[PDB]
């Protein structure tokens, strides 16, 4: 019968919870209770990119910290020059409902995807000189909510059918499929060394996957609602999760337990994007209150606010070298802050 | 030196010209999110006006030289609270319902679906066009005796046909009393906690009706006019 297996699983969960509690010798707040604060941090909008008609869900920086691709819900990708506010490329999409975009580490390719369940890859360095779909990756049974390049040829896509997949471009067929999430996966963050990654889903639980191994490794919980954003710490031994309960949390892989909770009674609307600074000392987080926020990852006190968006903040991205922070919003504007 | 940056400036100018053309063609079209259930009959609605894995379908139709751009969602999972936020910029949300769904009931599940759409955070401004489909099959279901609408909804016994009713000639009074009870169930939710930012436009449509192209236009026209008058504080 399934009942006895249910009690066995419940006992296993209780044992794991007891072990995690035993491993909690002390709280991170006590250790950092006498650390040096950073003080209030203020930022000013250096650039404001315009040209997108409808809202913006996706925005990805390049590896040179100079070009960023931005996707708009009218069916348009635009590659900007953050230095000169110059539109390098403007690529129309076959599907006008795009929920994500990416940027190859080599800078040769971009990707899109969304409500049509298809991830289309565009090569920007064609011999002719135009932009055309190198290929599309059909096979998912739910809206593709995120996709991040591992290299020029491996791309991992998380879909709304509760399963992530790893595809090889040349083959065009699913190399691997990671299943186990009960709710649809919202955002996956690749490791700094791109050997592991983390997938947060709508079941209020995140998972760690080994892309080479092909199965889950660790499971992290604590959130009370949908996980909207995942981001790895710069050194790759931690990640921050932002959810709909308007709280952020920091999880350490080796400790396999929550460390610090960034929350405030004033905050009511949930987080929609998170990102970390290049040194990991500064955690940026967009919200539904139409403005971003800045936290210190250790002291866990707000050290800045990025107001200036008159609609929902959907995408937030810090450069690889951590100079500028771009924020796109549902008002069809991107703002670079420095 | 200046030749390079001039070349990128020329590229930006041509790209911006293309974006202005795309804005001109995009701002002139009306995007409709067609909703409903598997048994409602939106498939026949799409097929009838189709006279001009994949996670979304597409049908383009023109009414009086106006571009309408209807999105039928298919091949998706049951949960719809995370991709429904993509449709917070559409002109209207068509919500087709099978009127004869009762006799389990399955008509209360349509009210709860319309209840959740109405009060969603991002759909507070999107007006809903309501189509009461299967208006033919409802006629025989109530004109059979083995319907008993009162058990599913107790209030049908105490409900009287409204004064502003305009029944079609030759319709049985018992048919029309049942017909207008269902409509007033959806208009109970719409008029409760909706302010004036969005409205509902019920229609007693059918699968063999050619006016559905006109009914969507005549109500999208009403929605845009009400939007302009709000910016001028004329309403």
């Amino acid at each position: 019968e399934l009942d006895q297996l249910r009690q066995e699983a419940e006992q296993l969960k209780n044992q794991i919870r007891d072990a995690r509690k035993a491993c909690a010798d002390a709280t991170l707040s006590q250790i950092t209770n006498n650390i040096d604060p950073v003080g209030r941090i203020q930022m000013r909008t250096r650039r404001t990119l315009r040209g997108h008609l409808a809202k913006i869900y996706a925005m990805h920086w390049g590896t040179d910290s100079r070009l960023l691709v931005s996707a708009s819900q009218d069916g348009k990708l635009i590659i900007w020059d953050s230095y000169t506010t110059n539109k390098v490329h403007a690529i129309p999409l076959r599907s006008s409902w795009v929920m994500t975009c990416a940027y190859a580490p080599s800078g040769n390719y971009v990707a899109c995807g969304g409500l049509d369940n298809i991830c289309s890859i565009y090569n920007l360095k064609t011999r002719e000189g135009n932009v055309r779909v190198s290929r599309e990756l059909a096979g998912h049974t739910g809206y593709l909510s995120c996709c991040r390049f591992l290299d020029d040829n491996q791309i991992v896509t998380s879909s709304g059918d509760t399963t992530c997949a790893l595809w090889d471009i040349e083959t065009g067929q699913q190399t691997t499929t990671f299943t186990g999430h009960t709710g649809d996966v919202m955002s996956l963050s690749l490791a700094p060394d791109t050997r592991l990654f983390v997938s947060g889903a709508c079941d209020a639980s995140a998972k760690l996957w080994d892309v080479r191994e092909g199965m889950c490794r660790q499971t992290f919980t604590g959130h009370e609602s949908d996980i909207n954003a995942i981001c790895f710490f710069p050194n790759g031994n931690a990640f921050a999760t932002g959810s709909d309960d308007a709280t952020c949390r920091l999880f350490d892989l080796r400790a396999d337990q929550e460390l610090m909770t960034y929350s405030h009674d004033n905050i009511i609307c949930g987080i929609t994007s998170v990102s970390f600074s290049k040194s990991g000392r500064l955690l940026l987080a967009g919200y539904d209150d139409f403005n971003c926020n800045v936290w210190d990852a250790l002291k866990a006190d707000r050290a800045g606010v990025l107001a200036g968006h008159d609609n929902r903040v959907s995408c937030l991205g810090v450069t690889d070298d951590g100079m500028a922070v771009a924020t796109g919003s549902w008002d069809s504007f991107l703002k670079i802050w420095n | 030196q200046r030749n390079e940056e001039k070349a990128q400036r020329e590229a930006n100018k041509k790209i911006e010209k293309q974006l202005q053309k795309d804005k001109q063609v995009y701002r002139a079209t009306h995007r409709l999110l067609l909703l409903g259930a598997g048994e409602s009959g939106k498939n026949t609605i799409v097929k009838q006006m189709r006279i001009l894995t994949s996670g979304i379908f597409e049908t383009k139709f023109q009414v009086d030289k106006v571009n309408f751009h209807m999105f039928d969602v298919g091949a998706q999972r049951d949960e719809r609270r995370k991709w429904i936020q993509c449709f917070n910029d559409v002109t209207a949300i068509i919500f087709v319902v099978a009127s004869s769904s009762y006799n389990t009931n399955r008509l209360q599940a349509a009210l709860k679906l319309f209840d959740s759409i109405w009060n969603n955070k991002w759909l507070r401004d999107t007006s809903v066009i309501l189509f009461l489909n299967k208006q033919d099959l409802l006629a025989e279901k109530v004109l059979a005796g083995k319907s008993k609408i009162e058990d599913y909804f107790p209030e049908f016994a105490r409900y009287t046909t409204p004064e502003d009713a305009t029944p079609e000639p030759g319709e049985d009074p018992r048919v029309t009393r049942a017909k207008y009870f269902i409509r007033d169930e959806f208009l109970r939710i719409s008029t409760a906690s909706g302010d004036g930012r969005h409205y509902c436009y019920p229609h007693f449509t059918c699968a063999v009706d050619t006016e559905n192209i006109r009914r969507v236009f005549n109500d999208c026209r009403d929605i845009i006019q009400r939007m302009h008058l709000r910016q001028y504080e004329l309403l």
Partner: nanobody
Amino acid sequence: QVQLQESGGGLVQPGGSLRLSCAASGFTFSNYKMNWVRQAPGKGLEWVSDISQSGASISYTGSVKGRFTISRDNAKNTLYLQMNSLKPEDTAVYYCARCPAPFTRDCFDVTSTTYAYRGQGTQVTV
């Protein structure tokens, strides 16, 4: 981890009364509206009753009007369902369902067949 556990169901003669309790752990009880959804044999999930954050707004389905009643103890973070004048058609599995996000008037896909914030269920036969 969010956990919901319902109890108090079982076989009963028609016309009796039931007291089903829903214990919730892992989240602030007050912020979320909560639902009671039943599934009859051979049929899909069906929504029965709902109570809001403060407990002021209570709504029922047509088939349970004037018979069932619900309440929420935020201090004891539990949900209640009380039955009156049972019928043979009420034999079903009852699931105490939650709301995906706090501070919202109503929320989607509670009655879905793959929802996450619902309990194992109580089988009630008449």
